[PDB]
Ligand binder design. Structure first.
Ligand code: SF4
Ligand code: SF4
Ligand code: FES
Lengths: 121, 119, 116, 688, 216, 73
């Protein structure tokens, strides 16, 4: 009674299935759904940065990937994006428990990365 | 005897008196005649032949007056008369019983997805 | 220049006046009020008024009609140069052509406020 | 009645309310809209946000108006100094741990917390301590979590327990460290899982496909209908120019209450891919772009060069009534009669509307105390209808099922699985018949998978005998219901879109057409479109039907046109254009009127109002939009009339009564092109 | 012609106590009692002259606008000599959708008043050209912007809009960008009016909160 | 540049000094130099190497800004 459904035998068109926008690690699990709008579809552009940057110029995402995560003592960190709090972003409180150098926590305003060796680990 | 004091025919007579000076000043002597101009201005009047209110008639006559002095004082030139008065009339009487058997719907279909806005 | 006091230069009602930029980046209520005042704006209560100022060309007045929204329902602008230029028919009578420009210059007219 | 409406006083104004109403409902009946965060009309009362605090005379404390019942002669005050101080204090407590996230939050512009802080709160804060920070949770591809913005209203938990039925969310921890979610990494598996994003009053739960793309103030909203199934849920389409940005439900208590399935909510991204925007004619090189005059001429030439008996017209699942009546009149004007429907049972008799519609209606089904489902899976056919069935289950309506056993998120009694079990139920061998015979208002719901069967007439005769014996249809109550799963089927049955007797005979001896008109059909069978035939495809997506065609005529999608659709209860509803036509596409009935002019026999209507008047001339209930008639019931005279169809094609008592929907997330050309639906399927495949 | 320079010293006062008290408190009742047939409604509100006071608003019929304005100009207690403006406000929900508004200033006693007349699109309002000389251009502008006809005007013609402009732009049902636009044509060698096309259409932002209480 | 002198060749660390905005120049103030800083050069207007939008004819590949994908058979 109530037989299980086999999802693996469900057909998906190959044009649709190969065009899913997904994410690299960053602020999500790697490989989850990436939100997109219609801009760039007529020109065949499936990438975020290519929609406004032209050439082999260094992207902002490649700039922030070169800054290493920062070791912070404690359980919560406050992120302003600047030494002066008037000159940065609104303050962001980022959880640091469960974080390491390999899996750090990222600020949603600045893209800076933080971790703590204080959660008994 | 004539509805609302016969003001439509009095205004029509006033415009018809004003018309040859318009033809001379705007230099429309070889473009249109006074007979066809009188017929065109008559066709402007018939569009509101079913107005049941005298105040709407008075407002329409006042607005038509202000149109006729902005034509008299050269505030609209001959190309304005061409693009607003006589070519809409010639388009409404030129497309009647065309050389093609297409309905108006099929011409609209082949033109665009939506109806035309304005002139 | 001699009686300038120290103190606030803005009204402290945060539901009308936007907060300071340091306050907006550190408190939640200020950021909410900054977000809402810069998108929807404050809602003016329903009513009407006419307010006038001794502008350097005369009386400049605004007739504001409010239904209650974040947008003016009707905003009539009263300009003094509009009334001053209406007088040129009775002021230039009996004058010569070289006095028209003097009359126009002494009425102090600017056509941005005349032609709104 | 012993004064079933009691009188209370709200700000010294007398208000009459029904008995059992709360203080908040009395304030709502007085024209006062009390601020709230945890109360919902469709959920159970919680009473934990403390925002609805009002003052009642002879009570020294503020009462929670959502939970407090209203007594006789009660005096409620909503604008005293203690009420305003209570509102400001509760708002200040709500905002001390909230993150300064309004620029990056998707609720900014349509946030209950923001607007209630602006109106009922203060303008300052006095809090300079460090805030609480929470890690985010993974709940699948449709729900995005930023859990630092949670305000612990527990609307999500109550929704998942009460409406969705899955009951997978909870509150773990205690105190300030209370934390919403699943303890282990799990995926939200409900079909109604996008509704919790609407139910969350803050940006803790937002829509992942929609994320960071638009603000709500930029969107032009259009009230339309949903065509992804046969219920016709009422929706609002939000667009920015030519692009549809999101789809939301809107209230209709007779149809969908406030819900919408995930397919109807998230399939809009398929409208940006594989779109037909130009007419094409197949040449020696293949299909290539042509003018509208050339494409219409080629279609007319193929439609006129063939004999009338070699022409077939197939309607799709999403064709509106105007285009269907246009195609029907155009093909009948040429002397053809071969009409087919992509949704199956094209030869089904459509003589009385009560035999293929839900006579009880959707809202009238709630007055039933016992429900018998025959051969249907309502969770995959219409999840909003199945949610209303669960709502009926929660307040006492018992459910039995004859069919293949399925997960329905409520307990049911499995009477059987085949028409042999249906006959045993009608005879009296199963004790569920005595449960039906003693019920005050029994109901029978027949699904579309029964009507797709080759022996559907014998099964319907057995169902009619069961309804006659169990008192399902009597004086004052009609409990016989047939539901559908396709948007265009009931309108085609209403107008008479069916094949003639000669065409049915020619299909019986195996005649094959040479010209096929595909009105938006992409799930046709291979028996209906022969190889080597001339195919005219009229549609909006490039799919199976357009890759095979010789002439392609681009039409409108349901977000671009205003066409009529009838749901399975008989209610006439309409779409509305939220965006203009794409490219060089046209209106769908207009293509057929132009094609009838190019063929040589014009349709007698030249406007949208005129084709709607033609529809109203065929069946007069088409003119009454947003309403449903009471259909005529002819007792057993109709079943007596079609006994020849029962004698021929006899009963198959061993084939199980199943549901034909095997792919819920991809049912038509729009949902097959949606990348979000493909991610939804991939998420259920990677969990094994 | 009033408020002649009389005191040669600096004055540290505005008005007298008795006349300011009469103007700020009793003027509504006074106007209602002396000329009751002229007044149909009165509002005493937030005071055009200053933020600290209250001032009346008088509603009247078009049949008695001229006698009421003559009374308000020439009566010894209400010497409203200056007419500051004439305008209109459109209320499409009403049977008579227009409110013609007259503001007045009294230099004799430092007062202000507002006078309103409600008419629809086809009811004429009597002109005040003989009472106040500025009423000419303001009535011309009101006819131009709203289509209110002022009977008895010497020359009611449009003053602000374009030469061939039909249509009254300040109505609520008139579009913000209009119907026609203007360009130069090289073939016709003339500046030509054409139907409107926009490279970027206007984006309407609907900001209004569903919790807001003040919307009326 | 004696023959084609232009104020767009003044660097931003001298711009505020020469425009009397501040009293800072490199000879008395150590400015913070970002790693992405583009040096100041003369304007390119009037030539064909000026800035143009992405839908322009002078671009390497002009954009059609359609927000949907067309079906290609
Ligand atoms: S939920 Fe989002 S938009 Fe609302 S107040 Fe919090 S951060 Fe701002
Ligand atoms: S996630 Fe949203 S609905 Fe759930 S408890 Fe938090 S605020 Fe309430
Ligand atoms: S709405 Fe009553 S306590 Fe939350």
């Amino acid at each position: 009674v109530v037989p299980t459904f086999d999802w693996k035998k469900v057909p998906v068109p190959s044009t649709t299935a190969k065009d899913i926008p997904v994410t690299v690690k960053g602020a999500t699990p790697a490989g989850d759904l990436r939100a997109t709008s219609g801009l760039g579809l007529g020109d065949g552009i499936k990438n975020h940065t290519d929609k406004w940057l032209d050439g082999d110029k260094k992207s902002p995402m490649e700039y922030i990937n070169e800054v290493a995560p920062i070791k912070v003592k404690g359980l919560v960190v406050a992120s302003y994006g600047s030494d002066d709090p008037a000159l940065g972003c609104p303050v962001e409180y980022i959880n640091l428990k469960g974080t390491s150098l390999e899996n750090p926590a990222v600020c949603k305003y600045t893209g800076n990365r933080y971790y703590s060796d204080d959660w008994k680990g | 005897k004539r509805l609302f004091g016969g003001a439509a025919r009095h205004f029509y007579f006033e415009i018809c008196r004003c018309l040859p000076f318009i033809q001379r000043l705007h230099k429309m002597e070889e473009m249109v005649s006074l007979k066809e101009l009188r017929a065109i201005v008559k066709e402007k009047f018939k569009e509101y032949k079913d107005v049941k209110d005298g105040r709407v008639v008075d407002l329409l006559i006042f607005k038509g007056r202000e149109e006729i002095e902005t034509y008299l004082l050269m505030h609209k030139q001959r190309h304005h008369v061409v693009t607003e008065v006589v070519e809409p009339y010639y388009a409404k009487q030129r497309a009647v019983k065309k050389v093609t058997t297409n309905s108006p719907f099929l011409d609209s279909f082949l033109s665009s997805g939506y109806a035309a806005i304005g002139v | 220049l001699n009686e300038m006091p120290d103190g606030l230069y803005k009204s402290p009602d945060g539901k009308v006046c936007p907060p300071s930029r340091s306050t907006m980046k550190q408190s939640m209520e200020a950021l909410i009020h900054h977000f809402k005042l810069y998108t929807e704006g404050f809602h003016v209560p329903a009513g009407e008024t006419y307010r006038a100022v001794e502008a350097p060309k005369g009386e400049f007045g605004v007739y504001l009609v409010s239904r209650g929204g974040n947008r003016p329902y009707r905003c009539k602008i009263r300009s003094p140069g509009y009334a001053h230029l209406q007088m040129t028919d009775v002021i230039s009578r009996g004058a010569m052509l070289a006095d028209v420009v003097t009359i126009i210059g002494t009425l102090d007219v600017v056509f941005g406020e005349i032609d709104r | 009645p012993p004064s079933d409406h009691l009188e209370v006083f709200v700000n010294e104004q007398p208000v009459k309310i029904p008995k059992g109403s709360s203080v908040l409902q009395a304030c709502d009946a007085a024209g006062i809209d009390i601020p709230r965060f945890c109360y919902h009309q469709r959920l159970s009362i919680a009473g934990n946000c403390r925002m609805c605090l009002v003052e009642v005379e002879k009570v020294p404390k503020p009462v929670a108006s959502c939970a407090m019942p209203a007594g006789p002669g009660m005096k409620i005050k909503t604008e005293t100094p203690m009420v305003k101080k209570a509102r400001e204090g509760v708002m200040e407590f709500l905002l001390i741990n909230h993150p300064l996230d309004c620029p990056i939050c998707d609720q900014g512009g349509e946030c209950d917390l923001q607007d209630q802080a602006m109106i009922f709160g203060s303008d300052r804060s006095r809090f300079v301590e460090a805030k609480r920070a929470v890690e985010d949770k993974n709940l699948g591809p449709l729900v995005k979590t930023v859990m630092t913005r949670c305000i612990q209203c527990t609307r999500c938990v109550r929704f998942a327990s009460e409406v969705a039925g899955t009951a997978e969310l909870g509150v773990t921890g205690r105190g300030r460290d209370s934390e919403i979610g699943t303890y282990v990494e799990k995926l939200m598996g409900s079909e109604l899982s996008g509704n919790v994003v609407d139910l969350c009053p803050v940006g803790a739960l937002t829509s992942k496909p929609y994320a960071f793309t638009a603000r709500s103030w930029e969107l032009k909203g259009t009230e339309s209908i949903d065509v992804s199934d046969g219920l016709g849920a009422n929706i609002r389409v939000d667009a920015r120019g030519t692009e549809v940005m999101r789809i939301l439900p809107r209230l209709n208590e007779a149809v969908n209450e406030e819900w919408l399935s995930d397919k109807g909510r998230y399939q809009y991204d398929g409208l940006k891919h594989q779109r037909l925007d130009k007419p094409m004619v197949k040449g020696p090189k293949g299909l290539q772009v042509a003018t509208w005059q050339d494409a219409l001429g080629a279609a007319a030439a193929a439609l006129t060069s063939a004999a009338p008996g070699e022409v077939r017209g197939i309607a799709g699942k999403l064709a509106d009534a105007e285009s269907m009546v246009a195609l029907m009149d155009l093909l009948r004007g040429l002397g053809a009669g071969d009409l087919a429907h992509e949704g199956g049972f094209s030869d089904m008799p459509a003589d009385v509307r009560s035999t293929y519609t839900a006579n009880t209606t959707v809202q009238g089904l709630e007055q039933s105390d016992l429900v018998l489902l025959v051969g249907t899976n309502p969770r995959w056919e219409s999840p909003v209808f199945n949610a209303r069935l669960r709502k009926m289950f929660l307040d006492g309506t018992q459910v039995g099922l004859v069919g293949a056993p399925v997960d329905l998120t409520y307990k049911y009694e499995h009477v059987g699985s085949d028409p042999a079990a249906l006959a045993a139920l009608a005879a009296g061998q199963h004790p569920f018949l005595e449960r039906l015979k003693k019920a005050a208002r029994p109901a029978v719901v027949v699904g579309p998978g029964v009507l797709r069967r080759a022996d559907r007439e014998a099964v319907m005769k057995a169902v009619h005998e069961l309804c006659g014996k169990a008192g399902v249809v009597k004086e004052g109550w009609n409990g016989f219901n047939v539901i559908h799963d396709t948007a265009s089927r009931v309108a085609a049955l209403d107008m008479g879109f069916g094949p003639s007797a000669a065409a049915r005979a020619r299909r019986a001896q195996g005649a094959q057409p040479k010209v096929v008109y595909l009105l938006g059909s992409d799930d046709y069978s291979e028996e209906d479109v022969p190889e080597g035939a001339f195919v005219i495809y009229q549609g909006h997506h490039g799919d199976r039907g357009a890759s095979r065609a010789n002439v392609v005529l681009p039409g409108a999608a349901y977000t671009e046109k205003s066409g009529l659709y009838v749901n399975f209860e008989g209610r006439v509803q309409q779409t509305r254009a939220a965006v203009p036509l794409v490219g060089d596409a046209r209106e769908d009935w207009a293509i057929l009127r132009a094609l009838s002019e190019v063929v040589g026999k014009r349709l007698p209507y030249d406007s949208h109002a005129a084709v709607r008047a033609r529809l109203a001339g065929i069946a007069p209930h088409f003119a009454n939009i947003d309403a449903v008639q009471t259909p005529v019931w002819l007792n057993g005279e109709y079943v007596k009339g079609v006994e020849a169809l029962a004698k021929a094609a006899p009963l198959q008592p061993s084939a199980p009564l199943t549901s034909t929907i095997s792919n819920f997330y991809m049912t038509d050309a729009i949902s097959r092109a949606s990348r979000t639906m493909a991610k939804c399927i991939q998420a259920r495949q990677q969990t094994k | 012609g009033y408020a002649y320079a009389r005191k040669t010293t600096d004055k540290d006062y505005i008005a007298s106590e008795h006349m300011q008290a009469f103007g700020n408190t009793q003027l509504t009742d006074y106007i209602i009692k002396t000329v009751p047939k002229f007044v149909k409604m009165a509002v005493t509100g937030p005071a055009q002259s200053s933020v600290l006071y209250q001032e009346p608003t008088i509603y009247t019929t078009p049949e008695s606008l001229v006698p009421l304005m003559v009374f308000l100009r020439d009566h010894t207690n209400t010497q409203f000599k200056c007419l500051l403006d004439v305008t209109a406000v459109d209320f499409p929900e009403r049977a008579a959708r227009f409110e013609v508004v007259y503001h007045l200033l009294s230099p004799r006693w430092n007062n202000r008043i507002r006078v309103k007349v409600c008419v629809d699109e086809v009811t004429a309002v009597p002109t005040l050209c003989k009472v106040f000389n500025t009423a000419n251009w303001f009535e011309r502008e009101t006819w131009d912007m709203f289509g209110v006809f002022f009977s008895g005007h010497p020359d009611l013609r449009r003053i602000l809009t374009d030469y061939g402009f039909t249509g009254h732009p300040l109505r609520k049902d008139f579009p913000m960008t209009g119907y026609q636009e203007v360009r130069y044509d090289y073939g016709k060698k003339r500046v030509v009016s054409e139907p409107l096309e926009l490279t970027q259409e206007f984006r309407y932002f609907d900001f209004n909160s569903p919790w807001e209480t003040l919307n009326r | 540049d004696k023959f084609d002198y232009n104020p767009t060749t003044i660097p931003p660390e001298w711009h505020g000094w020469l425009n009397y905005i501040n009293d800072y120049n490199p000879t008395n103030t150590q400015f913070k130099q970002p790693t992405y800083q583009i040096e100041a050069s003369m304007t390119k207007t009037g030539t064909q190497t000026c800035y143009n939008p992405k839908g322009s004819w002078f671009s390497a590949k002009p954009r059609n800004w359609r927000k949907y994908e067309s079906w290609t058979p």
